[model samples]
Target: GPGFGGVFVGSFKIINYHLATIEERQSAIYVDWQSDVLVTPIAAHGRHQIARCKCNTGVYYCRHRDKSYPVCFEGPGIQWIEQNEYYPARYQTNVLLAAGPAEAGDCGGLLVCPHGVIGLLTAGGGGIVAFTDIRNLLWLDT
Candidate 1:
């Protein structure tokens, strides 16, 4: 309940910046809850499910401490973009980009396609947002 958003991927709580809720988007954080009962599962889209995005249609789900329901944002389709093009040069890598609504506390949210969860909401402004591609996290299983 202290994060912008988080998902129970396997036995780990997949989130951005672990417990550090500052505005770090360069990497991801995973916490091994070890099959805790409090952990719930949500449907997500993996690498194989990624599809070409177009127009405004996907949903962005963000967690907030003082809200009844998670902040659900709507925006255009998701697309892959070079991180350095929008973020600082030191953070160069491929990430997801989209146009949507944002606030000061949704940095660790998620963008979902029609299929399922797509990426982690990193940062954005002026109606544009960025997501850490969830596919890159597959290495954790190995």
Candidate 2:
């Protein structure tokens, strides 16, 4: 069976990247596949449409779902994944408790805004326990 590169009953061609002996031909141009290249980018973007980037054109560039996000464009797609998200800086216990006898009584907590303008987030839609507008918070910044 003289098929692929002189294939016989026992003429084997391993075609490996590494050097081989007689009766074996190693393909010099071999692509070494790696797992790290596509690991983290997909970790952030979710199970679908992972991210990948390379300086193929002499510039650092990344893309995802046919969208390009680059540092030069102020869109460090990967760097953004490093940044932290906003959350309640502080919290208070039972802030939703009504002050007067006519008001409904229920437990709640206070969400301290990033700028210290606290928000009253109750178990139910009780309402904002504290009322401090932007101007007021700006005037206070406390």
Candidate 3:
């Protein structure tokens, strides 16, 4: 059996800006990677954005700067999970990846890929968290 590792609450930061602008023109924007993990910051709006931001509960338009942004009609929230602390650390050995309470409502909380073929979705904030080796993760292309 694999030994239990230390768990930490996922921390996220929000930046109100466009993705394309930041990726190409911005100098202040940066990327961080820890082993196989890569983190990038992004902007979001509407339902999916709100969900990602963990701002509001219901699916509705969010008023910002006196403008109303539509809810994420296609999915859930709008906010982009920026790369930084939001990305989980990679485990060198094969391990079982699970979700915790902090990620309970959002589907984007925890992403796991075991065979590099298909990805698995952990129970966000519901049960034991485990994941297989880090090498199995081909890439976290977000």
Candidate 4:
């Protein structure tokens, strides 16, 4: 049984999302909306990045002020039930990204996770959950 949980939609907007690592030189990132409290893949530091699936379906290249950057890790319409955990476990991006959605039943990605919040999988069963807090989760807004 889960405890104290919930979800968010059409609430706020984020302008500039910037996160980094704290290891050594301090550089890295692993994003998320609602922390995969199941395993906690969404940490404060990582070497890669993962924005909302809707905002960025698949991996691609980005350019900013005459500069190009590599971007990847997005679960396009996924969910839980696959029975996977994000935190307390290391994995390959290929496997990790695909394991979104299904955070319910059997896999049950839904949980009344810590930090006083309801954790859920990504939209359309992507098992993602980019809806962390007001400022963490990125979105498709103009």
Q: Which number leads on TM-score?
A: 1
Choose the strongest candidate by lDDT: 1
Q: Between which residue pairs do clashes occur in model 2?
A: none
lDDT of 2 by residue, 2-94 (tens): 111110111111111111232222221222111000001111211111013221111111111222211111111111111112213333221
In the range 105-126, model 4's lDDT, one tens digit per residue, is 2222222222322223222244
lDDT of 1 by residue, 1-142 (tens): 2334455455344554423433322233433221111122235542323323432345665443333223333332334433433243234134555555655466676555665555566666666766655543443354
Query: Which sections of candidate 1 miss by over 4 Å?
Result: 1-3, 18-57, 62-89, 138-142
lDDT-wise, the better of 2 and 4 is 4
Where does candidate 3 have its weakest 10-residue lDDT segment? 1-10
Q: Which is the better candidate, 1 or 4, if ranked by TM-score?
A: 1
Clashes of each: 1, 0, 24, 35
Every candidate's lDDT: 0.45, 0.18, 0.23, 0.26
State the local distance difference test value for candidate 3: 0.23
Question: Cα RMSD (Å) between model 1 and the true structure?
Answer: 9.9
| Candidate 1 residue pairs that clash | 56-76
lDDT for model 2, on a 0 to 1 scale?
0.18
The C-alpha TM-scores of every prediction are 0.48, 0.15, 0.17, 0.17
Which digits, one per residue and each the tens of the lDDT, describe model 3 over residues 6-118? 11112212221121233433442332221222223334221111112211111111111222212211122122222323344332222233222223222212221222211
Error of 2 at 121 (Å): 3.3
How accurate locally is residue 127 in candidate 3, as Cα lDDT from 0 to 100?
37
Sorting all predicted structures by lDDT, with the top scorer first, yields: 1, 4, 3, 2
Each prediction's RMSD over C-alphas, in Å, is 9.9, 27.6, 17.6, 15.7
Error of 1 at 42 (Å): 15
Name model 3 segments beyond 4 Å from true. Answer: 1-99, 102-104, 110-121, 130-134, 137-142
